[PDB]
Design a protein around this ligand. Structure first.
Ligand SMILES: Nc1cccc(-c2cnco2)c1
Ligand SMILES: Nc1cccc(-c2cnco2)c1
Lengths: 195, 195
């Protein structure tokens, strides 16, 4: 609420980091290397961003990424398509969403219906090379499925602020070359923390 | 031109990375650590972004960061203020800009007048804790002055895609904890490279 923008801003940051491999590039430069071909990226302009959860934070994400010329689609079980259209988000049924997305970002609570929202079934329905962002709640994205999709190239990268267990005991996602991560910093700004 | 957006997008990426230390946080997590207090960040909303150079790229940067609620001011010797006003950028004389900025980004050519545009004289006129981005040309930001301002805290962080020498032989900027960097990736997208 008072932390909505901190969240949304971190989420946008993560999307940009996935598109250009900025954290990897920095680690590469810090290791004394100059690796330009390794870190060829993609432009966000004209890409499709799927936003699952169209509450305050997903809303704020959307209007920010619209400025980059991203197409913003999404799904929310409660919010009407005409309301979401009012902030530039095209609602489609979930099965329509998976194949269209170059990027997917989750902004849901952690419920039985959202636990493993992204799982081996839904990664298969994605376009090959999808990039995923979870800055919401650990578990929304199934961590095993994600690892499997990063291994196969079905998922080309992921950005995680949150984990099923915090700190994460299983290190295979954090250690993957295409995964960027933070220690649950979504609300960690001076402003959010400081009313 | 065809690479304007790739540049602008990397610049916005770097600004977000400075605000939230996503590269440093990723390296921290990769090293098995969970360091939440270390990576307290700042919100962009309500901050002032100074854009020095208001060509196509600086323009594109501006309209992106306006969506995050940044105030966008700038300076360009050639672009009219009425043109800059058309995309939400308030032109002030350079002496007016330095004290106002939370963030400063450079989008100029490398000329005698812009070599060391940011130098010890202009860092001293900055607000304490300014963050700086150079995704334009190596040398616009004086590298010695920058290091000095990082050492004192006058500059709270920098993001560099370019260096006076590439690859950089002097490693003190790249190695600084508050510096993020890439091997000149501003134009390295599939789209930019692929007309
Ligand atoms: N199944 C599914 C998909 C997308 C959003 C959500 C959601 C958000 N608020 C409660 O549930 C649920
Ligand atoms: N000194 C200064 C400051 C900001 C922009 C410029 C600039 C842009 N295009 C030619 O020079 C120069």
């Amino acid at each position: 609420n008072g932390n909505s923008l901190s969240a949304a801003e971190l989420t946008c940051g993560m999307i940009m980091c996935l598109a250009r491999q900025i954290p990897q590039a920095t680690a590469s430069m810090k290791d004394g290397k100059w690796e330009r071909k390794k870190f060829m990226g993609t432009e966000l302009n004209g890409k499709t961003l799927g936003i699952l959860g169209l509450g305050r934070i997903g809303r704020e994400v959307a209007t920010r990424m619209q400025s980059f010329g991203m197409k913003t689609i999404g799904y929310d079980p409660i919010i009407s398509p005409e309301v979401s259209a009012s902030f530039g988000v095209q609602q489609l049924p979930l099965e329509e969403i998976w194949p269209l997305c170059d990027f997917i970002t989750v902004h849901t609570p952690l419920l039985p219906s959202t636990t493993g929202l992204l799982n081996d079934n839904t990664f298969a329905q994605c376009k090959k090379g999808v990039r995923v962002v979870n800055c919401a709640r650990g578990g929304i994205v199934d961590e095993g499925a994600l690892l499997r999709a990063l291994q196969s190239g079905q998922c080309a990268g992921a950005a995680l602020d949150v984990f099923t267990e915090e700190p994460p005991r299983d290190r295979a996602l954090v250690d993957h070359e295409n995964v960027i991560s933070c220690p649950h910093l979504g609300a960690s700004t001076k402003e959010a923390q400081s009313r």
